[PDB]
Design an enzyme around this catalytic site. Structure first.
Site, PDB file in Angstrom:
ATOM      1  N   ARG A 187     -10.548  13.199 -26.748  1.00 48.70           N
ATOM      2  CA  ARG A 187      -9.211  12.085 -26.967  1.00 48.70           C
ATOM      3  C   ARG A 187     -10.213  10.738 -27.330  1.00 48.70           C
ATOM      4  NH1 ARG A 187      -4.234  12.957 -25.925  1.00 48.70           N
ATOM      5  NH2 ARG A 187      -4.269  11.055 -26.836  1.00 48.70           N
TER       6      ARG A 187
ATOM      7  N   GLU B  13       6.196  36.599 -10.757  1.00 51.31           N
ATOM      8  CA  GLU B  13       6.522  38.186 -11.102  1.00 51.31           C
ATOM      9  C   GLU B  13       5.186  38.950 -10.875  1.00 51.31           C
ATOM     10  OE1 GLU B  13      10.487  37.614 -13.945  1.00 51.31           O
ATOM     11  OE2 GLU B  13       8.802  38.508 -14.697  1.00 51.31           O
TER      12      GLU B  13
ATOM     13  N   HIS C 277      10.957  39.409 -16.336  1.00 49.38           N
ATOM     14  CA  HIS C 277      10.640  39.445 -17.578  1.00 49.38           C
ATOM     15  C   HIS C 277       9.375  39.995 -18.281  1.00 49.38           C
ATOM     16  CE1 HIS C 277      12.696  36.118 -15.593  1.00 49.38           C
ATOM     17  NE2 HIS C 277      13.352  35.549 -16.849  1.00 49.38           N
TER      18      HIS C 277
ATOM     19  N   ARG D 183       0.032  10.491 -26.876  1.00 46.47           N
ATOM     20  CA  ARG D 183      -0.468  10.660 -28.337  1.00 46.47           C
ATOM     21  C   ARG D 183       0.589   9.669 -28.930  1.00 46.47           C
ATOM     22  NH1 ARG D 183      -2.639  16.296 -26.986  1.00 46.47           N
ATOM     23  NH2 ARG D 183      -4.564  16.479 -28.345  1.00 46.47           N
TER      24      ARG D 183
END
Ligand SMILES: O=c1cc[nH]c(=O)[nH]1
Ligand SMILES: O=c1cc[nH]c(=O)[nH]1
Ligand SMILES: O=c1cc[nH]c(=O)[nH]1
Ligand SMILES: O=c1cc[nH]c(=O)[nH]1
Ligand SMILES: O=c1cc[nH]c(=O)[nH]1
Lengths: 250, 250, 250, 250, 250, 250
Positions: free
Chosen positions: F220, F77, F5, F165
């Site tokens: 957070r 890859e 790819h 979340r």
């Protein structure tokens, strides 16, 4: 009716607390026959109930059907009606070469190859039988001079792949059960049946006593085939054994 | 010199077929001293081993250390030498209000809360105690006449979080075990200990017979501290039951 | 005492915050002997603790016994006592062809093949070692010129099946582990041991720093059990660097 | 005769390839009654079969009994005799506030809360219905004007715990299922039933076509008190649906 | 913009409620060009979005990038924006000998070999497509003219090991996936792709509708490997069907 | 062009063996812009690659896209092309109250909340970073100068539910992740990101080196979605560190 499936009532039990529970409805009456005042109670779907007396106390004999799901409905509703002890009397095939047809098998605990078990306790929990029930069974077996084997049983949700049968439509076995029979054999597992794992686990985790005896009809490792009959003789022996056992538990 | 950890040979056992496996290396001597001709054999790591005689029969007493890992090593090498029967005698904490300290608990099968048992059989396999042994242990407890309870035992790999203890360094319990004590209680589990799951599973999967007896030293519900004699009188008490049990298994 | 198993009091540690922890209680003495003012503190079960000083600061040497269960006890109570940094030091079976016996292996992280770790963190959580601790071990080994290998370690809850040993009583290995050695090997796992998993996990998830190193006593790509002579000064290299490492972490 | 449980021969099926499979044995004749040349075939255990005709194509109607175990025997043996397409018609309890009693539910795929399906494929595999069957069922349903819902359903191995019912003997539900119903509803799951998981999975993973339709008899969120003729009317409509659907599958 | 990754605002959608979600961002424009008034909306990371008109209705086309993680973001955020229906048009590697390159494959449900699906629903929940969407894709295929296969799909989180490809850097495949492709083929699974499990699960469990179709660019059972044809005719062929299918979902 | 790819040939790397892998294709350039002789190689899907030179050495910068799936492809890859060391540079969300936005976080090992990692190693294998890579990253942080924190990070397959979340379309989180954030927090986990688990597991179990570093862009414990001047500097920062860490690993 007090329960949803069994079509019975508290009164219908005449104060019974122990219930013998075979898998086949056709066997309910035969067993009840061995006791006093055997009367049919009800019959819906795979659950055929019968009542009887044993040394004064009233005893229930009800069928479960095949698999843990149906079994869990009988045990559940039977418990709701006052049943506290459950004894399994069935027929099974041995996966051990030395276990020969005509041998009786008392189960101490089962390999949970089912799914209902999990609906009562995490897989960690042991599908263990009640000591009293197990003890009673071995004694009732010994008393009737039977060739008894006590130990672990493999409780499968399927009759074919879970018991590594390849003689089927697909002819294939899912990865998990591929080669699993050699395994259980090596671990000493005595046989394959389909409702103990659910019965023992749900009872052992709910304050209910359970036990299981079973006559050996066939043997997955031998070549010879049942004599001039199969069920008949042994079939009736394991039945006498569980009834006798019931006597020392009332 | 044969076995790798125990440092024992076939000859040292003297033909012994059955062994008593306490957890504490200090309890080994005390148990062997309750039988005839006690003689220390070896002592490496947490495995101190002794030999004795019950009715002219050579019997082994080898500690296992705390947990399933050390236990698995002791049992394996012991079986490599000829042992086929194992009786574990330990201390335990009850989680049922009616089981007060000083009682004796015989384990039929265990809730597998360890890791070593999985090295012998998949989680679906029942950590179930051998029948003969369990029978012997129950009878023996009834001989010496002790407040006895028979049932399942939760065998944890940890003394603190695994048994839902919050009074620790961090004070937290991982999700898997949060609320778990109330669960085991609700399911009728009798107690917490740390080697039965591994002992019972590896033995029921390899043809070895094993029994498990334990003295209650604490009750997770009650509010109290080891009276004085509490674990001591308890220990010397169960130590008699198991020896008396082994006597029946020789 | 302040704790339940080790039989120590915070005062016994004299403000020591770091502890060297060998599995074998018979090495606590040997290791404390390489430091200053070695003073024995206690010995209960497989928990043998000694105190010493390194660069004027106090350090603790306390055995953990074999396996995570006894280890989880040691670490916890020791941490309740005041230790915040734990450096394990042990023996190990290498599974790579190049790793020679005597070499020192520093563990960055472990393959959780135990059960105690799950009592502190779900399997997704890495059984990873503290960076400072690992660094100290790596550098201490450099300033000693010891053949050092640092990487992933497989921590098993058993010494036999878990480490895929076939030279056993039953001679079989449960499915989960059949062919498991070549798999780890292909993955570049360095060795086998029985405590890093539960040690590294319990510490990493409770604000405790932990380090791990071991001496190779057998190469599993050659034999299952070593014939090799255990204790002159061969695998002492591991100890020397664990001390030298501790020196840096004070 | 050709199979072990059903008591049938391929000749008895006379070329049939599609079978309707209800749970309750008594609904078999009723289903057959709406077709041409219906005839009783056999009745063993909870397996009651009938054969009929449609568009001059033979069709089979066989009961599976309650639960996956029982069902897996029926489906396998039906498949051994030549059945390729399976349509299950059953009763059910909706968990959605918008799905009312009498409504008709067509199942696209089921939540695998069973154990038997695992005996055919790993959990990752979807218990999905064949597209042609699902189409015939949705289609047939629109033709007789029923109020339909097409979606996923929870297929449980138990009627009580697995469907989070607390009105039971023990009054408890394993951690696994506490608050589970509120989670299925939140996920859009339409209802609870007890055989689709095993049926759908074993068919989808062995090249068999299967689909499922059911009628709502109870709403677990409220009180549409069982208007005793309700189950009667609600069932006739589904039965006509499954038959009309079958017609489009011959 | 109203979202964090997509860079889109509700206005951008112009009342659109359906989205065609290809995996390749470069395919986005190609797809929109089969509609009316295509307009590039935005491009951030692997998220390229275009708006177009389909029979007068506003329709969105947004790439998702490879894998469930990227897919989960696009779908969540597109949903925040107003989208209710998602159509996945992708490429795949067929694994059945009878499915040729250039064929069109519609997915009813996928094997969950991903990890994102578990972030929306437990593994027991099915990764099934919406009935209307799957119907639309089956019909479009017919209206377009193509060789179409309908069934289960293997949705892997990787392109190599999870699809048992061996010509990789390591040349080895983790136990979990050894002999897995041969196993799926046996289960009738028709192909491998990398985002349907996530998409289907997250949509079926959150009230959104999802459809899955792809073009076979390779067959893992043949030696022949198509040249430009991959991203050629086959791609364009599946691209026309999803747009055609989309018209029926407005 | 040699790989499937990335559109790159081995000759394109000019003998490069180390690659920096950001998750965003748009930063590949900015990163290359910091080295010598930066040349654009290719851009396919979310895989944008460049080549540069450091102290007379070739280095690759290739985006992996969001998530383990596309990340496993880029890595795989790139490895087939000669790369044996991967340094990931990303953006993250601090879970601990003390880690501030702009802070640089080096990952030792990560909680595997992904699925791709399972495609290279079982779940007990640690998603542990390479020691040399982690060291250089920590050392590079001292050089560039930054508030650094070295520890465990949670790698999630989803950006919303996996990171618990609630600013979402459904507003609800699946059971597995309910209250999961403060659990990781209490275990000392410092941040949430989405590629390290796959990167670290696939490399550490396949003999490749990998390190992890990321700049905090939100905390957070005080907010769910990112703010004010942002990456303009935070990104530049972390990039400066990873580039300098690369100089040290050549
Ligand atoms: O609580 C207790 C007491 C003894 N042994 C245990 O494992 N737990
Ligand atoms: O091979 C060996 C040696 C020591 N410790 C282990 O766990 N394995
Ligand atoms: O609630 C109900 C009704 C019928 N069948 C079930 O399984 N559940
Ligand atoms: O084999 C293949 C081809 C395309 N896409 C995949 O995911 N796999
Ligand atoms: O909150 C955040 C920020 C960056 N990356 C994540 O995965 N989560």
């Amino acid at each position: 009716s007090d329960v949803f499936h069994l079509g019975l009532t508290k009164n219908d039990l005449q104060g019974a607390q122990l219930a013998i529970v075979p898998g086949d409805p056709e066997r309910v009456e035969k067993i009840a026959a061995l006791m006093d005042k055997p009367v049919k109670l009800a019959s819906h779907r795979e659950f055929t109930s019968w009542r009887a007396e044993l040394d004064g106390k009233a005893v229930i004999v009800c069928s479960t059907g095949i698999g843990g799901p149906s079994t869990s409905i009988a045990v559940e509703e039977l418990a709701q009606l006052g049943i506290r002890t459950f004894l399994r009397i069935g027929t099974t095939g041995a996966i051990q070469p030395h276990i020969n047809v005509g041998d009786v098998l008392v189960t101490t605990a089962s390999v949970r190859l089912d799914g209902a078990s999990l609906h009562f306790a995490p897989m960690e929990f042991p599908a263990v039988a009640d000591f009293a029930c197990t003890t009673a069974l071995v004694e009732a077996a010994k008393s009737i001079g039977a060739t008894t084997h006590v130990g672990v049983t493999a409780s499968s949700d399927t009759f074919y792949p879970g018991q590594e049968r390849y003689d089927t439509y697909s002819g294939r076995v899912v990865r998990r059960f591929k080669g699993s029979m050699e395994e259980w054999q090596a671990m000493g597992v005595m046989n394959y049946e389909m409702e103990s794992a659910t019965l023992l686990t749900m009872c052992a985790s709910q304050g209910l006593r359970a036990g299981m005896v079973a006559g050996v009809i066939v043997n997955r490792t031998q070549q010879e085939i049942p004599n001039a009959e199969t069920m008949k003789q042994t079939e009736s022996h394991a039945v006498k054994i569980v009834v006798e056992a019931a006597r020392r538990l009332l």
